[PDB]
Scaffold this active site. Structure first.
Site, PDB file in Angstrom:
ATOM      1  N   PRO A   1       0.738  -1.177  -0.183  1.00  0.00           N
ATOM      2  CA  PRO A   1       0.262   0.094   0.140  1.00  0.00           C
ATOM      3  C   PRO A   1       0.709   1.331   0.091  1.00  0.00           C
ATOM      4  O   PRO A   1       1.874   1.336   0.368  1.00  0.00           O
ATOM      5  CB  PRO A   1      -0.708  -0.178   1.393  1.00  0.00           C
ATOM      6  CG  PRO A   1      -0.178  -1.142   2.217  1.00  0.00           C
ATOM      7  CD  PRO A   1       0.451  -2.150   1.140  1.00  0.00           C
ATOM      8  N   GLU A   2       0.386   2.371  -0.735  1.00  0.00           N
ATOM      9  CA  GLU A   2       0.976   3.770  -0.510  1.00  0.00           C
ATOM     10  C   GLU A   2       0.475   4.653   0.736  1.00  0.00           C
ATOM     11  O   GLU A   2      -0.328   3.948   1.445  1.00  0.00           O
ATOM     12  CB  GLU A   2       0.290   4.484  -1.658  1.00  0.00           C
ATOM     13  CG  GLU A   2       0.622   3.855  -3.111  1.00  0.00           C
ATOM     14  CD  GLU A   2       2.111   3.786  -3.601  1.00  0.00           C
ATOM     15  OE1 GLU A   2       2.378   3.033  -4.453  1.00  0.00           O
ATOM     16  OE2 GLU A   2       2.753   4.644  -2.924  1.00  0.00           O
ATOM     17  N   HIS A  92       0.344 -17.640   3.496  1.00  0.00           N
ATOM     18  CA  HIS A  92       1.321 -16.535   3.460  1.00  0.00           C
ATOM     19  C   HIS A  92       1.491 -15.807   4.980  1.00  0.00           C
ATOM     20  O   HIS A  92       1.776 -14.559   4.725  1.00  0.00           O
ATOM     21  CB  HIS A  92       1.417 -15.813   2.365  1.00  0.00           C
ATOM     22  CG  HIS A  92       1.160 -16.389   1.194  1.00  0.00           C
ATOM     23  ND1 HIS A  92       2.490 -17.491   0.573  1.00  0.00           N
ATOM     24  CD2 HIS A  92       0.362 -16.780   0.284  1.00  0.00           C
ATOM     25  CE1 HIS A  92       1.998 -17.977  -0.490  1.00  0.00           C
ATOM     26  NE2 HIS A  92       0.644 -17.480  -0.766  1.00  0.00           N
ATOM     27  N   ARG A 111       4.568 -11.791  -1.096  1.00  0.00           N
ATOM     28  CA  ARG A 111       6.033 -11.487  -1.192  1.00  0.00           C
ATOM     29  C   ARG A 111       6.968 -11.757  -0.165  1.00  0.00           C
ATOM     30  O   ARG A 111       7.960 -11.593  -0.351  1.00  0.00           O
ATOM     31  CB  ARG A 111       6.177 -10.074  -1.887  1.00  0.00           C
ATOM     32  CG  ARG A 111       7.284  -9.653  -2.674  1.00  0.00           C
ATOM     33  CD  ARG A 111       7.207 -10.391  -4.204  1.00  0.00           C
ATOM     34  NE  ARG A 111       5.989 -10.467  -4.783  1.00  0.00           N
ATOM     35  CZ  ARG A 111       5.039 -11.280  -5.623  1.00  0.00           C
ATOM     36  NH1 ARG A 111       6.115 -12.357  -5.811  1.00  0.00           N
ATOM     37  NH2 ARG A 111       4.072 -11.384  -5.837  1.00  0.00           N
TER      38      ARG A 111
END
Ligand SMILES: [Zn+2]
Length: 250
Positions: A1-2, A92, A111
């Site tokens: 997220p930004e 994950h 990731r």
DNA sequence: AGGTAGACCCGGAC
DNA sequence: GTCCGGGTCTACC
């Protein structure tokens, strides 16, 4: 997220964890933990502490406990969830904070790219990763003067400058390309080549890009510019994929 | 020392 | 099967 989405997470997560007491910390990928260096010490120290607050610095979340602060970065794909200890974990999931009420704060990331640091609260701002962080882009501490003084002393391109977390907090590749487009400035321009007018316009558009947050240039290579119809182009600048309109930007 | 390169990570794109 | 994309730190010159 930004940055804007991290702020949303901060606001949403706070009421879901405030006042809860940590009973266990379970770590499935130790390398997420960057301080203390031993993930077992990280886990042990948090147990018994109650969550008191949740603050944001750039794209970092700072969880405030009784004695310690947990500094967490999700990068692009990390996510937090609060859910029951009775239910199976999401795929994950790398770190889980178990609370005494049978709920959990879970960090998951396909990731596996996020990081966590814990220090005494009073030490957090002067240690990595918060130590060298520049001003909040929406704060008066981020000004044209601040931008100008950094731009004057460097040989770097304007893009490399805005990507530097010590200049301003939270500007990554997307908002850098978009802000530069909105300001009419080529990303490859040396930072030192920007006039006073250009520095002032760039500051204004950076604040607007962040404040507003829907794309003019990022990922739009080969499609028409939304302002002039010229095909958007992509190149490498500061070691990053860089998107721009060769007509609108100069 | 200012500034780039290495390191981390892996789905999906070539 | 090799490599990009992404942010932010440490490791060099
Ligand atoms: Zn254009």
């Amino acid at each position: 997220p930004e940055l804007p989405e991290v702020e949303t997470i901060r606001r949403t997560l706070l009421p879901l964890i405030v006042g809860k007491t940590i009973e266990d910390v379970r770590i499935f990928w130790p390398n997420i933990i960057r301080h203390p260096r031993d993930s077992e010490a990280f886990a042990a120290r948090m147990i018994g502490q109650t969550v008191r607050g949740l603050e944001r610095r750039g794209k970092f979340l700072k969880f405030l406990l009784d004695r310690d602060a947990l500094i967490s970065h999700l990068r692009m794909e990390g996510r937090y969830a609060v859910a029951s200890a009775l239910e199976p974990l999401e795929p994950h999931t790398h770190v889980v904070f178990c609370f005494t009420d049978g709920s959990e704060l879970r960090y998951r990331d396909v990731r596996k790219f996020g990081t966590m640091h814990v220090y005494a609260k009073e030490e957090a701002d002067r240690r990595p990763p918060l130590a060298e962080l520049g001003p909040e882009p929406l704060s008066p501490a981020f000004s044209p003067a601040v931008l100008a003084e950094r731009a004057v002393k460097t040989k770097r391109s304007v893009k490399a400058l805005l990507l530097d977390c010590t200049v301003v907090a939270g500007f990554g590749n997307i908002y850098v390309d978009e802000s530069l487009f909105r300001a009419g400035i080529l990303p490859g321009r040396p930072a030192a080549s920007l006039s006073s007018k250009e520095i002032e316009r760039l500051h204004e558009e950076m604040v607007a890009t962040i404040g507003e947050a829907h794309l003019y240039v990022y990922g739009r290579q080969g499609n028409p510019c939304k302002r002039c119809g010229t095909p958007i182009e992509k190149t490498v600048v500061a070691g990053r994929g860089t998107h721009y309109c060769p007509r609108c930007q100069r």
